[PDB]
């Protein structure tokens with residue numbers, strides 16, 4: 001439907017192995033968006049093309065204030081193009097380096113927005129699995145927007161593994177190579193939540209190998225300034241056993257959420 005000549009490319013928004021995302025304006029609509037440029041070249045070499053058109057599948061038929069829109073795609077010779085909703089306020093990652101830590105009220109809010117976002121997603125048996133600060137964009141309202149549905153997947157499944165990837169946000173089951181459902185995303189939400197308050201993720205290490213242990217044994221500790229309600233909800237989120245992990249609904253209802261969730 002679309003083609004490159006339909007756009008005016010703006011400034012580079014960032015990187016990634018397969019290319020860059022650029023700001024861009026739709027020529028005859030004046031519409032602002034982001035263009036993720038992916039080289040066919042590298043997608044095949046690094047055998048991921050399967051993933052692409054699945055990221056496209058899922059993130060297309062998806063509609064939620066807290067999920068980055070994907071308007072469509074296209075390609076030419078050299079590369080494939082992803083027409084992404086543009087999120088004015090950068091990444092939560094970046095806001096994190098920026099602020100070093102978030103407060104209870106900012107954290108809570110994100111969790112809420114996050115919860116609901118994920119809520120909608122499970123409802124369609126869609127599991128994200130790769131929720132990390134780098135993947136969280138901010139809308140103008142300052143609101144969370146889950147990007148990147150690359151690893152995203154249906155059903156309760158088992159993945160084609162490959163170890164070479166940051167474990168920091170993976171749940172024990174995933175990492176241990178096991179039976180994993182939509183409970184992963186609640187483990188994620190827990191990590192996310194801890195990182196927001198403390199400034200690093202609770203399982204951080206210097207090596208793939210140590211983290212693996214750390215995650216596998218659920219070894220984490222709270223700095224003093226982490227409040228009780230925080231500790232509670234995080235503790236409740238970070239159970240080795242998928243089954244003991246709250247339902248998203250319970251997370252919304254948690255008293256430390258609702259005390260603090262501005263939005």
Ligand SMILES: O=C(Nc1c[nH]nc1-c1nc2ccc(C[NH+]3CCOCC3)cc2[nH]1)c1ccc(F)cc1
Nearest residue numbers: 013014015016021034084085086087088089090091
């Ligand atoms: O695709 C990406 N980002 C986006 C998708 N949609 N919208 C974006 C997006 N990212 C940014 C980053 C910065 C800004 C502008 N803002 C100005 C004020 O200071 C903070 C940055 C906009 C933007 N949109 C993306 C982001 C980060 C990566 F590492 C790889 C890809």
